[PDB]
């Protein structure tokens, strides 16, 4: 390789184009792929392979390729442009060797139908790593990598860009495309338990490990729950699906564990072992569980098949609470 030269600063009159095709993106930065042969551009410092850092004092460092070229479209004809540039042949070789320019993650919030074999369909919820923001030489269509099982990079497709995406969203909270990153809770997370012994779990955990656990005094009232988090203690909560959907909204992501009853009689065998005082019908508890399951399991993060013969649940519960707590989640950044 070689060392970098001094930082260029440049003034030249825009014709009916600045005469500049670009490579790059946000992570590697916005570079010049080419100068228009004969241009006012080329009359200055701007050869192939320089990075564009600034324009009319505008931050080109944290800026997607697409919404570079538009900023370079917008600029009135026959007007001055004041680009602050640096060569960086080291960063550009990499670009041309492996294209890589754009890299950010976007969580979807609307269904889409694929209208071309390379396109990707997607429910609301599907996170995508966006890697191209002018697919080939075109506005409208981004390149993307599908993100599914344990956050892997699984399928390489093309999707509608952010604005088109909101159109198709509009003809139907949440953009069409949220921009998100991966984080672990900087705090202990509220816990939400479901299934026919859920009330015994809150009982047991909260009592038998009263150091880590505290049942939030109820209905939601999350100053009950913050004033519980503040204490490095898990907010055990008896709440509902909407009540959860809502806490998702705020990115206060709880852990939602589902204790899946094995059988109708199962429940009875179990509740009898653990709470003979309880007056609550097993039929009624089983029946609930399945509605809650049949309608929206999008709630529960992790689930646990109660084995009615024992109380292994209690263990595999602790485990899961304490291994989800070590789980990276998606959170917003806009």
By the 8 A CB rule, do 48 and 33 touch?
yes
Bridge partners for 298 per DSSP: none
Q: Is 221 helix (H, G, I), strand (E, B) or coil?
A: coil
The structure was resolved experimentally with: X-ray
Separation in Å, CA 304 to CA 121, 195, 238: 31, 10, 17
Q: Where are the alpha helices (DSSP H) in the chain?
A: 66-69, 71-74, 89-97, 162-170, 198-208, 223-229, 241-249, 264-274, 282-294, 313-324
Q: Tokens 């014709």: give the residue.
A: 15
Six-digit token string for 22:
């670009």
Resolution in angstrom units: 2.8
DSSP code string of 160-203 = E-HHHHHHHHHT----SEEEEEEE--SS---EEEESTTHHHHHH
By the 8 A CB rule, do 85 and 99 touch?
no
Separation in Å, CA 192 to CA 113, 217, 255, 311, 317: 34, 14, 6, 19, 11
By the 8 A CB rule, do 301 and 206 touch?
no
By the 8 A CB rule, do 65 and 24 touch?
yes
- Residue 295's contacts (CB-CB under 8 Å, 6 or more residues apart) are none
> How many other CB atoms are found less than 10 A from the CB of residue 182?
13
By the 8 A CB rule, do 33 and 21 touch?
yes
- Sequence length of the chain is 334
Provide the phi-psi class of 216: left if phi over 0, else alpha when psi is between -120 and 50, else beta.
beta
- Residue 160's contacts (CB-CB under 8 Å, 6 or more residues apart) are 112, 140, 141, 142, 168
Nearest Cα neighbor of 49 from 8, 108, 110 is: 8
Domains of the chain from N-terminus onward: 1-102 (2.30.42.10), 103-172 (2.30.30.40), 173-334 (3.40.50.300)
Nearest Cα neighbor of 213 from 314, 328, 308 is: 314
Nearest Cα neighbor of 259 from 267, 250, 247 is: 267
> How many other CB atoms are found less than 10 A from the CB of residue 114?
13
Q: What are the φ/ψ torsions at residue 145 (nearest 5 degrees)?
A: -120, 120
Separation in Å, CA 310 to CA 142, 268, 313, 322: 52, 13, 8, 21
């Amino acid at each position: 390789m070689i060392l970098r030269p001094s930082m260029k600063l440049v003034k030249f009159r825009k014709g009916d184009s600045v005469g500049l095709r670009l490579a790059g993106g946000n992570d590697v930065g916005i570079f010049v792929a080419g100068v228009l042969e004969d241009s006012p551009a080329a009359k200055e410092g701007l050869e192939e392979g320089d990075q564009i850092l600034r324009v009319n004092n505008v931050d080109f460092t944290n800026i997607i390729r697409e919404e570079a070229v538009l900023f370079l479209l917008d600029l009135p004809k026959g007007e001055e442009v004041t680009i602050l540039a640096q060569k960086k042949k080291d960063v550009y070789r990499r670009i041309v060797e492996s294209d890589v320019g754009d890299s950010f993650y976007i969580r979807t919030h609307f269904e889409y139908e694929k209208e071309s074999p390379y396109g990707l369909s997607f429910n609301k919820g599907e996170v995508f790593r966006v890697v191209d923001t002018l697919y080939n030489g075109k506005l409208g269509s981004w390149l993307a990598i599908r993100i599914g099982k344990n956050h892997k990079e699984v399928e390489r497709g093309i999707i509608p860009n952010k604005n088109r995406a909101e159109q198709l969203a509009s003809v139907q909270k949440f953009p069409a495309y949220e921009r998100v990153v991966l984080r672990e809770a900087g705090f202990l997370r509220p816990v939400t338990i479901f299934g026919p012994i859920a009330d015994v779990a809150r009982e047991k955990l909260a009592r038998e490990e009263p150091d880590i656990y505290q049942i939030a005094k109820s209905i939601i009232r999350l100053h009950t729950i913050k004033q519980i988090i503040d204490q490095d203690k898990h907010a055990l909560l008896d709440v509902t699906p909407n009540a959860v959907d809502r806490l998702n909204y705020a990115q206060w992501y709880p852990i939602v564990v589902f204790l899946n009853p094995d059988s109708k009689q199962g429940v009875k065998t179990m509740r009898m072992r653990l709470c003979p005082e309880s007056r609550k019908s097993a039929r009624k508890l089983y029946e609930r569980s399945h509605k809650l399951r049949k309608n929206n399991h999008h709630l529960f993060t992790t689930t646990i098949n109660l084995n009615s013969m024992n109380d292994g649940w209690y263990g595999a519960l602790k485990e899961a609470i304490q291994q989800q707590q070590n789980q990276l989640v998606w959170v917003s950044e806009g």
